[PDB]
Design a protein around this ligand. Structure first.
Ligand SMILES: Nc1ncnc2c1ncn2[C@@H]1O[C@H](COP(=O)(O)OP(=O)(O)OP(O)(O)=S)[C@@H](O)[C@H]1O
Ligand SMILES: Nc1ncnc2c1ncn2[C@@H]1O[C@H](COP(=O)(O)OP(=O)(O)OP(O)(O)=S)[C@@H](O)[C@H]1O
Ligand SMILES: Nc1ncnc2c1ncn2[C@@H]1O[C@H](COP(=O)(O)OP(=O)(O)O)[C@@H](O)[C@H]1O
Lengths: 348, 323, 173
């Protein structure tokens, strides 16, 4: 009945995530502390055990969704994944907040005692930010109105969930023990933080001019974030209080992309290597081709998500004639193959 | 069991004029089912799925490639539409009808979507792309088996392949300025589109309106640029299920011969292109022409053969009869 | 050889006036329906296109009249249903299977004679999809008719076990 440690869970994620050290510590410590809180259940000397949610921040295609999915594999309690862009303020045409709890029970097979001990994740949280700039009569619903509904959910209270797909029977489900991991790529947040921190100068002659912001520093700038910086973005102070912990994820570097195709077991290189291993054929991928693929990805400003297009576009012809081909034991791909000038060398 | 070369020939029998698209679907479907025969038991655990994205004009045979492929492969297949807040559960239950409410057999089925560009730029517009993201990656949806037990069956969405079909409008202008040349308005500046679509990339799709997260799930790309005029004639002659052969077979049991000269088929190509609808707007041209002939053919006696001329399509003349 | 397209148009002219083009279309589809069932799927042409009818016209144009006048001239039974009272999931309003039940009453429970029957529906616009305001009178009803039109078998209690009655051979208007 031994629970996993923060070091053990961190090593498990290293085999599926690359280039994110500070964020791994938060999820490991939070998930570790989560098991302890639910396990004790105000039975030990420690009475009224609190809760601490997590707020992930990082650019697009940085790996936020990856940590949420890979973590659920080793996680014992259930896990779900939703989006807040479709939520509405209790009555509009779009959606209801309790739909999140409905998807949670599907993973737990309608086990209330087991669902309360589960974990929940939210994606695209930046879309919830104030839209109208200190709103007017329009009564923003997609924005501010959504945060107010979540306030009680994140803190803890009973709710109502349809049993088998309704919209006259509702079951109560507490949420004080349920954890939430909100995350969404924020747009323009770097500008807001930079403008606030690095400026103490007027435009006139007498005012002194502070020399700062020499480099962009996207990774090091988000580290200096604070709740007041988010208020200018559009978030409410009450909502930020429900999410005390913060995590800053750095963008992807060129060399980082090479590691993603070699270190993790789910790398596409290992997938295609195993795709031909069943056929009794070997595969190879030289460094001359991997570094070039990273340049094509950054050139297209698509990131690691749009990386399969570069691989499948090259091996399209080879995969077509490979099944019919016989007496072929190994295939070698070169940098020229990625450009398309040459064809991958085949070993008979 | 099949091979890319074997499936290419079968597709060729019912489809023509699209050579590059055949190799794309062949290797894709081949490796897709390979993962089902052998899953995570090999060293390459958690083999990811490769979705497919078709790009071509309307009536360019986008639906036939998915529909005909489904017939060849003994697996279920349904047809979805981008018009149908989430409204994503209807697509799952729609597939179980053909599969007789089977979990494993349905999971290996394929699904097709039409008018995928209609949502690019609200819960029915851009809100649909965001919802599909999880569907095109893997999830489970409740589906009442038989309609009703008070229970539901779980059907993963990682094994089911998706083919997002559609026709992008104005995409040619986006790629021209980015790759070929910035022109169209100047004097020296240059004032088929198919060749341009081959050089398409995901970066151009972002300016079109699509979401990069949505495009990342579909690395495969297909270019059903256009259909040739002769191909239309071949479409009515090479496929065994051609409409020309249907009417020919319709009158065979009646004991009357039918004919279709080449000088009459070329006119149908002009009316088809004039409507900018492709092969879908073909029966309207045929059924509207043969309506007069079919109306009085049973009444007429001692007629063994019928000939349709080019003038007949226009309607100015009457189809020649043979006694 | 009871039906003649040249004669069927002459008979409708007695009871209907002002629609010459529409009368020609019905004579072709109606004649093609029985011409097909005379030799079912035995010809060389495989995957033959299904023959159905879609009447579209303004008010008082005679849509409902053609359905009634046709049945009188015709021998096979006829039914006149409506999409306004149809519901889904066995609700209190009505079920799609009721259309098959009424057909047998006209045919006196003759499956061989019922498969060659005609079907007519009015106010098809009512089942048109609408944005969410549950909506039972909509897409759900269309799905039942779609699987029913594409050809299937539906349970029918004989005389009020159940009987299976194919529908790929039954016409729909
Ligand atoms: N650190 C990483 N290591 C390996 N693969 C990664 C990493 N980060 C991103 N990826 C790849 O990018 C894909 C998408 O990751 P996501 O977590 O969705 O990125 P993202 O920043 O969350 O984008 P969003 O959620 O739309 S803002 C993953 O399935 C991986 O293939
Ligand atoms: N072509 C016609 N010739 C003669 N009388 C007609 C014609 N069409 C309609 N009528 C008259 O209108 C009455 C109703 O005809 P209907 O077929 O119900 O018209 P309708 O347009 O089909 O109505 P709906 O909207 O389809 S229920 C008939 O009983 C006739 O008196
Ligand atoms: N290359 C082709 N060969 C044979 N038939 C074709 C071809 N392209 C289109 N068709 C015809 O077009 C019809 C399907 O059109 P569809 O693909 O649904 O149009 P859209 O893609 O605009 O929905 C089929 O009946 C098919 O016979």
């Amino acid at each position: 009945s031994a629970l996993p440690t923060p070091h053990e869970i961190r090593n498990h994620l290293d085999d599926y995530v690359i280039g994110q050290e500070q964020a791994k510590k938060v999820l490991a410590v939070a998930v570790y502390n989560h098991y302890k809180r639910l396990r004790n259940g105000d039975t030990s000397n420690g009475v009224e055990l609190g809760k601490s949610n997590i707020l992930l921040i990082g650019p697009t295609g940085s790996g936020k969704t990856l940590l949420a999915e890979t973590l659920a594999r080793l996680l014992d309690v259930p896990f779900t994944m939703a989006d807040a862009t479709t939520l509405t303020e209790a009555g509009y045409v779009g959606e209801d907040v309790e739909n999140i709890i409905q998807k949670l029970l599907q993973k737990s097979d309608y086990d209330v005692q087991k669902a309360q001990r589960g974990i929940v994740y939210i994606d695209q949280i930046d879309k919830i930010s104030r839209k109208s700039d200190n709103p007017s009569i329009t009564r923003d619903v997609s924005g501010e109105g959504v945060q107010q509904a979540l306030l009680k959910l994140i803190e803890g209270t009973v709710a109502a969930v349809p049993p088998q797909g309704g919209r006259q029977e509702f079951l109560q489900v507490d949420t004080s023990k349920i954890l939430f991991i909100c995350g969404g790529a924020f747009a323009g947040l770097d500008k807001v933080i930079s403008h606030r921190v690095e400026t103490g100068s007027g435009i006139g002659f007498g005012a002194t001019v502070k020399a700062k912001s020499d480099k962009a520093s996207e990774g090091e700038l988000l580290a200096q974030v604070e709740p007041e910086d988010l208020i200018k973005f559009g978030l409410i102070p009450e909502f930020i209080g429900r999410l005390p912990v913060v995590a800053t994820l750095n963008e992807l570097s060129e060399e980082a992309l090479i590691q993603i195709l070699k270190e993790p077991k789910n790398a596409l290189t290992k997938q295609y290597q195993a795709l031909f291993n069943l056929e009794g054929v070997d595969l190879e991928f030289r460094d001359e081709a991997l570094d070039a693929i990273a340049k094509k990805a950054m050139a297209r400003k698509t990131g690691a998500r749009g990386l399969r297009s570069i691989v499948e576009a090259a091996l399209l012809d080879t995969m077509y004639d490979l099944p019919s081909m016989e007496d072929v034991e190994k295939v070698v791909i070169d940098e020229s193959v990625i450009d398309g000038q040459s064809e991958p060398l085949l070993i008979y």
